[PDB]
Amino acid sequence: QDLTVKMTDLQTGKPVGTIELSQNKYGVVFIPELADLTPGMHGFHIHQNGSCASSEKDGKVVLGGAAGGHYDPEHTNKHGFPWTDDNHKGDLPALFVSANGLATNPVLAPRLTLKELKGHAIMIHAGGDNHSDMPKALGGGGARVACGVIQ
Amino acid sequence: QDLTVKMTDLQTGKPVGTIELSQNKYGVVFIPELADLTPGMHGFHIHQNGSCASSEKDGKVVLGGAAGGHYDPEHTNKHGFPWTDDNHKGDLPALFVSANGLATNPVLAPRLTLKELKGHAIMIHAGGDNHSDMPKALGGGGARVACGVIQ
Ligand SMILES: [Cu+2]
Ligand SMILES: [Cu+2]
Ligand SMILES: [Zn+2]
Ligand SMILES: [Zn+2]
What we know:
The structure is a homodimer of 151-residue chains. Chain A has 151 residues and is mainly beta. Helices cover 3% and strands 37% of the residues of chain A. Chain A has one domain (1-151): Sandwich (Immunoglobulin-like). Chain A has one helix spanning 114-117; strands at 2-9, 15-24, 27-34, 40-42, 44-47, 55-57, 60-62, 95-97, 107-109, 121-125, 144-149. A 7-stranded antiparallel sheet of chain A has the order 5-10-11-1-2-3-9, with no helix packed on it. Chain A is globular. The A-B interface holds A 77-78, 80-81, 84, 86-87, 131-135, 137 and B 77-78, 80-81, 84, 86-87, 131-135, 137. Chains A, B: One of its GO terms (cellular component) is periplasmic space.
């Protein structure tokens, strides 16, 4: 009842490590083993489609655009906190990256279940996550930089 | 090009003063002359319907419920700041009430026009306004306490 997700750099195409998924009494824990990322905090969310391929938007290329928007099984249409109910179900706590480009700090998402995650995609963004649609939509994550399909 | 709005206490039914509306180069200015309110900051917004009568919700009475929800001519379905574009058009800066129950501090709403306000309703809430739907919907304003129809 724990899954391994391989993460890939959307820009370089090379592997970036993995994230272990575990179920617990208080929700789902995400334990990262990543490297080759930019120090700081990164928006981190479960996206809708089981894909990390690109998509297209207004004549331009959208890296990782195939995974669609944030996981939102209740159709809230809003972006928020991991412990608030009226916003995407796939909104997770932000992912911290060390000075050396490494990510190893685990996070908890109390509202999710391991079972429902299968076939979805995990995304890491360039930007941070303010857990609001203001002043920048979707918490200011911006571009997608790393992706992996939950098998 | 300036209108007077008479405000009424939803709980007592008695007049509470008025708010003057003026148009300027930077938006609409609301200048209050009120009294008989509770000290602090109060959620303040333009609501949809030209009414301050009650409505009904799940067997219970909703004071001022007839004015409907926040003015939202772009159908955003989100609550926010007065200077952010993707949320209700009728979201205004919060109204401060002095220790003596008086409200006299003017506020600016840059996104609105005096012309479009006619037939709408101005609402004062019990609660404050955090300019988010989290952690409480509609900024935590809660109950409606004072209302007036823009004529
Ligand atoms: Cu995302
Ligand atoms: Cu209101
Ligand atoms: Zn989201
Ligand atoms: Zn609003």
